[PDB]
Ligand binder design. Structure first.
Ligand code: HEM
Length: 185
């Protein structure tokens, strides 16, 4: 994973659980709590897992709940960094462009493997969106959806339809219902 994003995650963990909890967890992995994450570096997926596992241990919070909350908070951060994706858009449009955004933002990186986030209309007031990734970040995905709803101040209902692994990929399909219509033309 990329550095300052994970850096973002770590910052969020500090806000939720305190500096003490986070410092120790970073220390348990061989980091200095005040280690600088450079603007370019990349941090391994498996060290992230270990960090989150330790924060879970020390807070008693299940790691899936922690990921969900990190996802909910992360949307705000992405609005600081990529304001154009948020400006002048409604929630439905925002969610519908996510698959492309993740391709566009990683296409320059050798060996990149972004999540796929394909969405399509399934009713006049609803989309189905499918998470597809080797990383199995199901709760982060769901949390990001919830955080988007909060950020845009547009209420939604989210129903999980399918979950599981296939072809070496994790997949999670949800149906998202918007409060008033969005696919009538
Ligand atoms: C402006 C908003 C957003 C931006 C700029 C953004 C960008 C990114 C980028 C660059 C990555 C790293 C991908 C990689 O290193 O392979 C990532 C990870 C991820 N993104 Fe987003 N994202 C945004 C919002 C969302 C939303 C709304 C969702 C779901 C609906 C989402 C789902 C995910 C997930 C689940 C990951 C973890 C990587 C994985 O599971 O494979 N993101 N995001």
């Amino acid at each position: 994973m990329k550095g300052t994003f994970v850096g973002t995650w770590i910052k969020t963990l500090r806000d939720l659980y305190g500096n003490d909890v986070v410092d120790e967890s970073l220390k348990s992995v061989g980091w200095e709590p005040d280690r600088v994450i450079t603007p370019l570096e990349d941090i391994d997926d498996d060290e992230v897992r270990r960090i989150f596992a330790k924060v879970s241990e020390k807070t008693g919070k299940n790691v899936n709940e922690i990921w969900r909350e990190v996802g909910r908070q992360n949307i705000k951060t992405f609005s600081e960094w990529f304001p154009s994706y948020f400006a002048g858009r409604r929630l439905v449009n925002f969610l519908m462009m996510m698959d492309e955004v993740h391709l566009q933002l990683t296409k320059m990186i050798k060996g990149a493997t972004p999540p796929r986030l394909i969405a399509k209309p399934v009713a006049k007031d609803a989309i189905e969106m499918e998470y597809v990734s080797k990383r199995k970040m199901y709760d982060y995905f769901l949390g990001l959806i919830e955080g988007s709803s909060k950020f845009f101040k547009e209420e939604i209902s989210v129903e999980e339809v399918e979950r599981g692994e296939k072809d070496g990929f994790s997949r999670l399909k949800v149906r998202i219902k918007f409060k008033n219509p969005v696919f009538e033309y």
